[PDB]
Amino acid sequence: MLKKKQLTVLDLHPGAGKTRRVLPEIVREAIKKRLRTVILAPTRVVAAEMEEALRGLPVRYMTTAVNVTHSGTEIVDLMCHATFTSRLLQPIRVPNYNLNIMDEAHFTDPSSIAARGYISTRVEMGEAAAIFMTATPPGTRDAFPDSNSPIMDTEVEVPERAWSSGFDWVTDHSGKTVWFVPSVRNGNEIAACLTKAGKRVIQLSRKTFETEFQKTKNQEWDFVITTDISEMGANFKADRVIDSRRCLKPVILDGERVILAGPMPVTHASAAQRRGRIGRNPNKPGDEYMYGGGCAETDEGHAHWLEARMLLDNIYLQDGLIASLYRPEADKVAAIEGEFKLRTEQRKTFVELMKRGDLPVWLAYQVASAGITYTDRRWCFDGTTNNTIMEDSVPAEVWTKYGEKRVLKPRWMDARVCSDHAALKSFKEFAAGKR
Numbered sequence: 402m403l404k405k406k407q408l409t410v411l412d413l414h415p416g417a418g419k420t421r422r423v424l425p426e427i428v429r430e431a432i433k434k435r436l437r438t439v440i441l442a443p444t445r446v447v448a449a450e451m452e453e454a455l456r457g458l459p460v461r462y463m464t465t466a467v468n469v470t471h472s473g474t475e476i477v478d479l480m481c482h483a484t485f486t487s488r489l490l491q492p493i494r495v496p497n498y499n500l501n502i503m504d505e506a507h508f509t510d511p512s513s514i515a516a517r518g519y520i521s522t523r524v525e526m527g528e529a530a531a532i533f534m535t536a537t538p539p540g541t542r543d544a545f546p547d548s549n550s551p552i553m554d555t556e557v558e559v560p561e562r563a564w565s566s567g568f569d570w571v572t573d574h575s576g577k578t579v580w581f582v583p584s585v586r587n588g589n590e591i592a593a594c595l596t597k598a599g600k601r602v603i604q605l606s607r608k609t610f611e612t613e614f615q616k617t618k619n620q621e622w623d624f625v626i627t628t629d630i631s632e633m634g635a636n637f638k639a640d641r642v643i644d645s646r647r648c649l650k651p652v653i654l655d656g657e658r659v660i661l662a663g664p665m666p667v668t669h670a671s672a673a674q675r676r677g678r679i680g681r682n683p684n685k686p687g688d689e690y691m692y693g694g695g696c697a698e699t700d701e702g703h704a705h706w707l708e709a710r711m712l713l714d715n716i717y718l719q720d721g722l723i724a725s726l727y728r729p730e731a732d733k734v735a736a737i738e739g740e741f742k743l744r745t746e747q748r749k750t751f752v753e754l755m756k757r758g759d760l761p762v763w764l765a766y767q768v769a770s771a772g773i774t775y776t777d778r779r780w781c782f783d784g785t786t787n788n789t790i791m792e793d794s795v796p797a798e799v800w801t802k803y804g805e806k807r808v809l810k811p812r813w814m815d816a817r818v819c820s821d822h823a824a825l826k827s828f829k830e831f832a833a834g835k836r
């Protein structure tokens with residue numbers, strides 16, 4: 402696989418040893434061959450698992466998830482997908498890696514899609530080799546792949562709200578269950594129901610992932626309520642997966658606003674990854690997978706592919722050239738390569754709005770392309786009446802940096818900035834000039 406001008410897809414089934422067995426072998430071969438190598442992890446939890454599998458090998462950990470300082474003699478670097486993309490966007494110089502390994506190469510976050518596009522274009526150019534590791538490569542129509550031990554697959558009605566009766570099978574279970582809900586707000590309702598009935602529940606989401614995941618190993622639990630984030634290498638020692646088979650989809654309407662559409666069906670890749678959390682121990686056959694809906698290719702028209710084009714258009718590759726998306730996912734968006742390329746100053750504002758402001762890609766592009774500077778927050782208050790953000794059925798209020806109380810009413814509306822309490826609280830601080 403390590404020969405230049407080649408992109409290999411390591412599509413071994415979930416639990417086949419891609420990270421703990423195959424990855425150190427590739428690293429050993431790249432070090433032997435003097436290949437400047439990058440290892441891309443989806444999340445910080447996977448980076449810490451990779452450190453345990455690669456312990457002893459000379460790897461540079463460019464992540465705060467691993468307590469090891471580099472000696473300066475390493476030729477292999479390990480970082481998250483978002484860190485790779487962020488450094489490509491920032492004026493910091495990134496070496497030209499001869500070998501590019503991306504683990505969980507099915508991750509659909511905008512920075513993951515852009516990293517795949519950038520890496521695959523360098524391979525198409527003949528400048529590098531690449532390995533994409535995933536049980537479900539882009540384009541998979543198999544939600545029921547192979548496992549380490551047999552799994553009982555059961556199509557059933559899965560509750561998406563609190564219940565008084567009709568789901569005896571959910572609570573009448575002595576083992577541990579990992580339940581995939583379509584949203585944080587939906588998971589909070591089911592968790593409160595399970596808690597009320599005497600269960601121990603840990604809730605996992607994108608913003609709380611690192612801190613809460615530790616609790617699954619730290620203490621006994623009955624249920625884990627999680628969003629689609631646990632599809633990226635997160636491992637549990639459970640005997641059942643309850644899968645609603647639903648997810649939220651960010652959609653850009655008329656190129657003017659972003660809504661969270663759905664809950665709607667997950668893709669076959671997500672369904673296989675969610676099912677893949679169980680059936681991992683050959684000594685424990687009979688793990689259960691309860692699914693409550695079918696699959697659909699709901700990645701078509703998803704804002705993440707447009708946001709990935711926004712990122713790729715602003716990453717330098719060679720003179721005027723611009724990286725294309727990885728071919729099996731280049732049709733998920735109707736975008737012209739280069740149409741989001743910003744001028745030097747607006748591009749710097751675009752990067753600061755994402756890195757420091759923590760705004761979604763789409764919202765960061767609207768602000769930067771309008772010629773607004775990072776610290777100018779007037780746009781958070783001068784949108785139309787129907788762009789008013791609501792908190793507890795009443796318009797949200799913030800004190801501006803000028804000491805004046807104003808209704809939060811952005812010029813551009815992105816549902817992601819107020820999808821939950823933590824998101825809205827972070828957007829209030831942004832609109833107040835606090836970061």
Ligand SMILES: CC(=O)N1CCOc2ccccc2C1
Nearest residue numbers: 786787789794795796808810
């Ligand atoms: C934008 C705005 O001021 N409003 C929109 C309508 O919703 C409400 C709800 C509660 C208090 C006040 C309002 C009025």
